[PDB]
Amino acid sequence: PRKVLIISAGASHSVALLSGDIVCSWGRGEDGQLGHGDAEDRPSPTQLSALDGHQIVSVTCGADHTVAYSQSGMEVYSWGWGDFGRLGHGNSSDLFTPLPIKALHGIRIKQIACGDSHCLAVTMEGEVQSWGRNQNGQLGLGDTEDSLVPQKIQAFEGIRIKMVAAGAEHTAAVTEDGDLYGWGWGRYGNLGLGDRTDRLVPERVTSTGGEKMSMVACGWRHTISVSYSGALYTYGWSKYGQLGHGDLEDHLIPHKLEALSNSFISQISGGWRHTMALTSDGKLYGWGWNKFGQVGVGNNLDQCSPVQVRFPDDQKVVQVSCGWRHTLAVTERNNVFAWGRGTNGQLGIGESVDRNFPKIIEALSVDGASGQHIESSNIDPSS
Amino acid sequence: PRKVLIISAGASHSVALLSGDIVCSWGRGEDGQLGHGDAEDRPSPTQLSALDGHQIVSVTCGADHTVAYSQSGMEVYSWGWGDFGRLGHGNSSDLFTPLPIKALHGIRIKQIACGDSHCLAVTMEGEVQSWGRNQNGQLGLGDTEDSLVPQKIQAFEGIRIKMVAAGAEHTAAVTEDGDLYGWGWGRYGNLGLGDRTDRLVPERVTSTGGEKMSMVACGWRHTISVSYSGALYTYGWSKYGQLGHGDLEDHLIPHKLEALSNSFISQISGGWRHTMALTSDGKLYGWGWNKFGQVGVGNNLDQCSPVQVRFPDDQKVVQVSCGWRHTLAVTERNNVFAWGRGTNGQLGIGESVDRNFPKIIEALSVDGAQHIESSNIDPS
């Protein structure tokens, strides 16, 4: 019966929104990021009962916290690790069950990005509010003091923002008109501004291959964008080849990934040390650090150039999301796959070793012989 | 029949040095912090074979990395999560097996402290070198750029340092003559300097009532010191009551813990959000965040004043080390106990739920025994 609408991966956890107004989560539970009230890891997708009936329309993971929002309810919810104010409730308290971010009540939300310890929300009118750690200017407020509550980014006054993205300690955004911005911790060139200097307010990227940009995403210390013509650009850290240019060189400005130049990129995701890109014809390409199999190409060797991730019967991919050591994807057939590190249960396939090529999550998928059952949190996850 | 000489706890792992100069480790293995060459958690104490025969005399855990040194070998080793240069090898590579910090070769080491992502070593001549993340000045080098290799702290020229300590992003030290210093991230008052501002070089804590400090330790965002008279001082963050003053107030300068004024504190340790102090007569007191039972008092309720941790037959405690969510201790009977969060195997008692009061580690104890395991064993 239930379709997977949205998937998101955090550092060691995974969250999905399903049709029928249901959120589920699995993986590491130690900081409360799963939202079930307890602190235990969940190796199988588990219904987040506190959100039943809340008409949630989106979920987004940060490293060790989760955010979700309801259009109808006019509410944004957060839970997980609370340090530095990343949950936005005016304190640093962890939450093991979702609580509304009261400052955002009644605000019409378009999109939310979560990094390691900061978050941002774009409104329907293209305004941006940010909160959390700000030691390197990543909130975009023009200082270096953390904020425990959402703050309007005054620098974007009179500019319609389309989407935001957030890494460990940096932030990026694209406007509706195609401009690309970067701010925060900039030491690995990850802002795309041609230097290694932090920025306390958003600064526009001027080296964009002459192109307007339609989307952006952040990995831990790297950044990915897609241009109006569907070309893919990466910048920042490439120690593990996560920039995908066939070498291990950092780039301080956006650098077009030439190997994918004949494809039109439709979705992008940045992991800890790896990267995913989805083409308009449904082909998924992964690259970067592959120690735990998170690139999904059937080995544990790092990949400094894009390699297509393969699925049964070559079924097309429609969604992808990178965690720190795992990756999740949804296919056209409404199957959900996961691969990579499995030690916290983040793959959602029950108790399992790590996987280096895509494995179907039976509880969430049409196929797999059984489209099994998401579990109640009252089930003991160690049993 | 092997005595446990030193215990040290990291965020989610545990390391010990045994007689015969044997190193063992257990708990979270994902970042290489156990040093066995694989990435798997170890729920039981496991011999770190790469250090067999290296005559290691000390081990020290950071959050997700570990350091050790040999006097005879004149060598310092590090392994685990490599980002920001915390391992000190001139790169950002993680290490799943110990490698020597070549910059420290041939230097006589007195003590090493490890924080979240920076480390410091004190030499036998009282000089200090630091390395790792420096975004908030925690290296004490006068800037905010990370260092992938050890660097001398010039600010201490002419000052003989006795011991150092490191938290998440801050650092503290005491001199041989009892002066106390702090530097790095200072937003919760944890530097002890009377404000909430960072420092980029070491600065002396001038408000100690003229009292000299024999030792200092750091928790994640709090700091603990002991005077030459054995008085316990805490400062910094007390959101979880980890300063132990019977309330939840931060303190910007060192503050005497009045409730223990009749005891002489011999050892101290700071955890993520909890604290341990050991008296000269072997009584262990814990306080702070207790969600996972890490305070060791038989429940899961936070404690904002010291409570004595009880052991079987009231056996005296001789060593204690706080992790992020667990605690380790060694007793007079050569028994080793662990308590708190157990999900990564950090308690070392085999696969286990969390524990809220001390549980014996059979592999390392007299009361006590199974044995330490080879890394070849399947931990699953």
Coordinates of N, CA, C and O in Angstrom, one line a residue, chain A residues 67-175:
Chain A
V67 N 15.0 16.8 11.0 CA 14.0 17.9 10.9 C 12.9 17.4 10.0 O 13.1 16.6 9.1
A68 N 11.7 17.8 10.2 CA 10.5 17.6 9.4 C 9.6 18.7 9.4 O 9.6 19.5 10.4
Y69 N 8.7 18.9 8.4 CA 7.8 20.0 8.5 C 6.4 19.6 7.9 O 6.3 18.7 7.1
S70 N 5.4 20.3 8.4 CA 4.0 20.1 7.9 C 3.5 21.4 7.3 O 3.6 22.4 7.9
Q71 N 3.0 21.3 6.0 CA 2.4 22.5 5.4 C 1.1 22.8 6.1 O 0.8 24.0 6.4
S72 N 0.3 21.8 6.2 CA -1.1 22.0 6.8 C -1.0 22.4 8.2 O -1.7 23.3 8.7
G73 N -0.1 21.8 9.0 CA 0.1 22.1 10.4 C 0.8 23.4 10.6 O 0.8 24.0 11.8
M74 N 1.5 23.9 9.6 CA 2.3 25.1 9.7 C 3.4 25.0 10.8 O 3.6 26.0 11.5
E75 N 4.0 23.9 10.9 CA 4.9 23.6 11.9 C 6.2 22.9 11.4 O 6.1 22.0 10.5
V76 N 7.3 23.2 11.9 CA 8.6 22.6 11.7 C 9.0 21.8 13.0 O 8.8 22.4 14.0
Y77 N 9.4 20.6 12.8 CA 9.8 19.8 14.0 C 11.2 19.4 13.9 O 11.8 19.2 12.8
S78 N 11.9 19.3 15.1 CA 13.3 18.8 15.1 C 13.5 17.9 16.3 O 12.9 18.0 17.3
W79 N 14.5 17.0 16.1 CA 14.9 16.1 17.2 C 16.3 15.6 17.0 O 16.8 15.7 15.9
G80 N 17.0 15.1 18.0 CA 18.3 14.6 17.9 C 19.3 15.3 18.9 O 18.9 15.8 19.9
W81 N 20.6 15.3 18.5 CA 21.6 15.9 19.3 C 21.4 17.4 19.3 O 21.1 18.1 18.3
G82 N 21.4 18.0 20.5 CA 21.0 19.4 20.7 C 22.1 20.5 20.8 O 21.8 21.7 20.8
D83 N 23.3 20.0 20.9 CA 24.4 21.0 21.1 C 24.6 22.0 20.0 O 24.3 21.8 18.9
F84 N 24.9 23.2 20.5 CA 25.1 24.4 19.6 C 23.8 25.0 19.1 O 23.9 25.9 18.3
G85 N 22.7 24.5 19.6 CA 21.4 25.0 19.1 C 20.9 24.5 17.8 O 20.0 25.2 17.2
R86 N 21.4 23.4 17.3 CA 21.0 22.9 16.0 C 19.6 22.5 15.8 O 19.0 22.5 14.7
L87 N 18.9 22.3 17.0 CA 17.5 21.9 16.9 C 16.6 23.2 16.9 O 15.4 23.1 16.7
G88 N 17.2 24.3 17.3 CA 16.5 25.6 17.2 C 15.4 25.9 18.2 O 14.6 26.8 18.0
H89 N 15.5 25.3 19.4 CA 14.5 25.5 20.5 C 14.9 26.5 21.6 O 14.2 26.6 22.6
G90 N 16.0 27.3 21.4 CA 16.4 28.3 22.3 C 17.1 27.7 23.5 O 17.3 28.3 24.5
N91 N 17.6 26.5 23.3 CA 18.5 25.8 24.3 C 19.4 24.8 23.6 O 19.3 24.7 22.3
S92 N 20.2 24.1 24.3 CA 21.1 23.1 23.7 C 20.7 21.7 24.1 O 21.5 20.7 24.0
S93 N 19.4 21.5 24.5 CA 19.0 20.2 24.9 C 18.8 19.2 23.8 O 18.2 19.6 22.7
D94 N 19.2 17.9 24.0 CA 18.9 16.9 23.0 C 17.4 16.6 23.1 O 16.7 16.9 24.1
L95 N 16.8 16.1 22.0 CA 15.4 15.6 22.0 C 15.4 14.2 21.4 O 16.0 13.9 20.4
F96 N 14.6 13.4 22.1 CA 14.5 12.0 21.7 C 13.2 11.7 21.1 O 12.9 10.6 20.7
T97 N 12.4 12.7 21.0 CA 11.1 12.7 20.4 C 10.9 14.1 19.7 O 11.5 15.0 20.2
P98 N 10.2 14.2 18.6 CA 10.1 15.5 17.9 C 9.4 16.6 18.7 O 8.4 16.4 19.4
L99 N 9.9 17.8 18.6 CA 9.3 19.0 19.2 C 9.2 20.1 18.1 O 10.1 20.3 17.3
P100 N 8.1 20.8 18.1 CA 7.9 21.9 17.2 C 9.0 23.0 17.4 O 9.2 23.4 18.6
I101 N 9.5 23.6 16.3 CA 10.4 24.8 16.5 C 9.4 26.0 16.4 O 9.0 26.4 15.4
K102 N 9.1 26.5 17.6 CA 8.0 27.4 17.8 C 8.3 28.8 17.0 O 7.3 29.4 16.6
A103 N 9.5 29.1 16.9 CA 9.9 30.4 16.2 C 9.4 30.3 14.7 O 9.2 31.4 14.1
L104 N 9.3 29.1 14.2 CA 8.9 29.0 12.8 C 7.4 28.7 12.6 O 7.0 28.4 11.4
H105 N 6.6 28.7 13.6 CA 5.2 28.5 13.5 C 4.5 29.5 12.6 O 4.7 30.7 12.7
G106 N 3.8 29.0 11.7 CA 3.0 29.8 10.8 C 3.8 30.3 9.6 O 3.3 30.9 8.6
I107 N 5.1 30.0 9.5 CA 5.9 30.3 8.4 C 5.8 29.3 7.3 O 5.7 28.1 7.6
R108 N 5.6 29.7 6.1 CA 5.4 28.8 5.0 C 6.7 28.3 4.4 O 7.5 29.1 3.9
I109 N 7.0 27.1 4.7 CA 8.4 26.5 4.4 C 8.4 25.9 3.0 O 7.5 25.2 2.5
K110 N 9.5 26.2 2.3 CA 9.8 25.7 1.0 C 10.7 24.5 1.0 O 10.6 23.5 0.4
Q111 N 11.8 24.7 1.8 CA 12.9 23.7 1.9 C 13.7 23.9 3.1 O 13.9 25.0 3.6
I112 N 14.3 22.8 3.6 CA 15.1 22.8 4.8 C 16.4 22.1 4.5 O 16.4 21.0 4.0
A113 N 17.6 22.6 4.8 CA 18.8 21.9 4.8 C 19.4 21.8 6.2 O 19.3 22.7 7.0
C114 N 20.0 20.6 6.4 CA 20.7 20.4 7.7 C 22.2 19.9 7.5 O 22.4 19.0 6.7
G115 N 23.1 20.6 8.2 CA 24.5 20.2 8.1 C 24.9 19.4 9.4 O 24.0 18.7 10.0
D116 N 26.1 19.4 9.8 CA 26.5 18.8 11.0 C 25.9 19.4 12.3 O 25.3 18.7 13.1
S117 N 26.0 20.7 12.4 CA 25.5 21.4 13.6 C 24.7 22.7 13.4 O 24.6 23.5 14.3
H118 N 24.3 22.9 12.1 CA 23.5 24.1 11.8 C 22.4 23.7 10.8 O 22.6 22.7 10.1
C119 N 21.3 24.5 10.7 CA 20.3 24.2 9.8 C 19.8 25.5 9.1 O 20.1 26.6 9.7
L120 N 19.2 25.4 8.0 CA 18.6 26.6 7.3 C 17.2 26.2 6.7 O 17.0 25.1 6.2
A121 N 16.3 27.2 6.7 CA 15.0 27.0 6.1 C 14.8 28.1 5.1 O 15.0 29.3 5.4
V122 N 14.3 27.7 3.9 CA 13.9 28.7 2.9 C 12.4 28.8 3.0 O 11.7 27.8 3.0
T123 N 11.9 30.0 2.9 CA 10.4 30.2 2.9 C 9.9 30.2 1.5 O 10.6 30.3 0.6
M124 N 8.5 30.2 1.4 CA 7.9 30.3 0.1 C 8.1 31.5 -0.6 O 8.0 31.6 -1.9
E125 N 8.5 32.6 0.1 CA 8.8 33.9 -0.6 C 10.3 34.0 -0.8 O 10.8 35.1 -1.2
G126 N 11.0 33.0 -0.5 CA 12.5 32.9 -0.8 C 13.3 33.6 0.2 O 14.5 34.0 -0.1
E127 N 12.8 33.7 1.5 CA 13.7 34.2 2.6 C 14.3 33.0 3.2 O 13.9 31.9 3.0
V128 N 15.4 33.3 4.0 CA 16.1 32.2 4.6 C 16.3 32.5 6.1 O 16.7 33.6 6.5
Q129 N 16.0 31.5 6.9 CA 16.3 31.5 8.4 C 17.3 30.4 8.7 O 17.2 29.3 8.2
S130 N 18.3 30.8 9.6 CA 19.3 29.8 9.9 C 19.5 29.7 11.4 O 19.1 30.6 12.2
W131 N 20.0 28.6 11.9 CA 20.3 28.4 13.4 C 21.3 27.3 13.6 O 21.6 26.5 12.8
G132 N 21.9 27.4 14.8 CA 22.9 26.4 15.2 C 24.3 26.9 15.3 O 24.5 28.1 15.6
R133 N 25.3 26.1 15.1 CA 26.7 26.5 15.3 C 27.1 27.5 14.2 O 26.6 27.5 13.1
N134 N 27.9 28.5 14.6 CA 28.2 29.6 13.8 C 29.7 30.0 14.0 O 30.0 31.2 13.7
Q135 N 30.5 29.1 14.5 CA 31.9 29.5 14.9 C 32.7 30.0 13.7 O 33.7 30.7 13.9
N136 N 32.3 29.5 12.5 CA 33.0 29.9 11.3 C 32.1 30.7 10.3 O 32.4 30.8 9.1
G137 N 31.0 31.3 10.8 CA 30.2 32.1 10.0 C 29.1 31.4 9.2 O 28.4 32.0 8.3
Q138 N 28.9 30.1 9.4 CA 28.0 29.3 8.6 C 26.5 29.6 8.6 O 25.8 29.2 7.8
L139 N 26.1 30.4 9.6 CA 24.7 30.9 9.7 C 24.5 32.0 8.7 O 23.3 32.3 8.3
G140 N 25.5 32.7 8.3 CA 25.4 33.8 7.3 C 24.9 35.1 7.9 O 24.4 35.9 7.2
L141 N 25.1 35.3 9.2 CA 24.6 36.4 9.9 C 25.6 37.6 10.1 O 25.2 38.6 10.6
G142 N 26.8 37.3 9.7 CA 27.9 38.3 9.8 C 28.6 38.3 11.1 O 29.2 39.3 11.5
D143 N 28.6 37.2 11.9 CA 29.4 37.1 13.1 C 29.7 35.7 13.3 O 29.5 34.8 12.4
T144 N 30.3 35.4 14.4 CA 30.7 34.0 14.8 C 30.2 33.5 16.1 O 30.8 32.7 16.8
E145 N 29.0 34.0 16.5 CA 28.3 33.5 17.7 C 27.2 32.5 17.3 O 26.3 32.8 16.5
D146 N 27.1 31.4 18.0 CA 26.1 30.4 17.7 C 24.7 31.0 18.0 O 24.6 31.9 18.8
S147 N 23.7 30.5 17.3 CA 22.3 30.9 17.6 C 21.5 29.7 18.0 O 21.3 28.8 17.2
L148 N 20.8 29.8 19.1 CA 20.0 28.7 19.6 C 18.6 28.8 19.0 O 17.8 27.9 19.2
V149 N 18.3 29.9 18.3 CA 17.0 30.0 17.6 C 17.2 30.4 16.1 O 18.2 30.9 15.7
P150 N 16.1 30.2 15.3 CA 16.2 30.6 13.9 C 16.4 32.1 13.8 O 15.9 32.9 14.5
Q151 N 17.3 32.5 12.8 CA 17.6 33.9 12.5 C 17.4 34.2 11.0 O 17.9 33.5 10.2
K152 N 16.8 35.3 10.7 CA 16.6 35.8 9.4 C 18.0 36.2 8.8 O 18.7 36.9 9.5
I153 N 18.3 35.7 7.6 CA 19.6 36.2 7.0 C 19.3 37.5 6.2 O 18.8 37.5 5.1
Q154 N 19.7 38.6 6.9 CA 19.4 39.9 6.3 C 20.1 40.2 5.0 O 19.6 41.0 4.2
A155 N 21.2 39.5 4.8 CA 22.0 39.6 3.5 C 21.2 39.3 2.3 O 21.6 39.7 1.2
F156 N 20.2 38.4 2.4 CA 19.4 38.0 1.3 C 18.1 38.8 1.2 O 17.2 38.4 0.4
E157 N 18.0 39.9 1.9 CA 16.8 40.8 1.7 C 16.7 41.2 0.3 O 17.6 41.7 -0.3
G158 N 15.5 41.0 -0.3 CA 15.2 41.4 -1.6 C 15.7 40.4 -2.7 O 15.7 40.8 -3.9
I159 N 16.2 39.3 -2.2 CA 16.7 38.2 -3.2 C 15.9 36.9 -2.9 O 16.0 36.4 -1.8
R160 N 15.3 36.4 -3.9 CA 14.6 35.1 -3.8 C 15.5 33.9 -3.8 O 16.0 33.6 -4.9
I161 N 15.7 33.3 -2.7 CA 16.4 32.0 -2.6 C 15.6 30.8 -3.0 O 14.4 30.7 -2.6
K162 N 16.1 29.9 -3.8 CA 15.4 28.7 -4.3 C 15.7 27.5 -3.4 O 14.8 26.8 -3.0
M163 N 17.0 27.3 -3.1 CA 17.3 26.2 -2.2 C 18.6 26.4 -1.5 O 19.5 27.2 -2.0
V164 N 18.8 25.8 -0.3 CA 20.0 25.9 0.5 C 20.6 24.5 0.7 O 19.9 23.5 0.5
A165 N 21.8 24.5 1.1 CA 22.5 23.2 1.4 C 23.5 23.5 2.5 O 24.0 24.6 2.6
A166 N 23.9 22.4 3.2 CA 24.8 22.6 4.4 C 25.7 21.4 4.6 O 25.2 20.2 4.5
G167 N 26.9 21.6 4.8 CA 27.9 20.6 5.1 C 28.3 20.6 6.6 O 27.5 21.0 7.4
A168 N 29.5 20.3 6.9 CA 30.0 20.2 8.3 C 29.8 21.6 8.9 O 29.2 21.7 10.0
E169 N 30.4 22.6 8.3 CA 30.6 23.9 8.9 C 30.5 24.9 7.8 O 30.9 26.1 8.0
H170 N 29.9 24.6 6.6 CA 29.7 25.5 5.5 C 28.3 25.4 5.0 O 27.6 24.5 5.3
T171 N 27.9 26.4 4.2 CA 26.6 26.5 3.7 C 26.6 27.0 2.2 O 27.5 27.8 1.9
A172 N 25.7 26.6 1.4 CA 25.6 27.1 0.0 C 24.1 27.4 -0.3 O 23.2 26.9 0.4
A173 N 23.9 28.1 -1.4 CA 22.5 28.4 -1.8 C 22.5 28.8 -3.3 O 23.5 29.2 -3.8
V174 N 21.3 28.5 -3.9 CA 21.1 29.0 -5.2 C 19.8 29.9 -5.2 O 18.9 29.6 -4.5
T175 N 19.8 31.0 -6.0 CA 18.7 31.8 -6.1 C 17.7 31.3 -7.2 O 18.1 30.5 -8.0

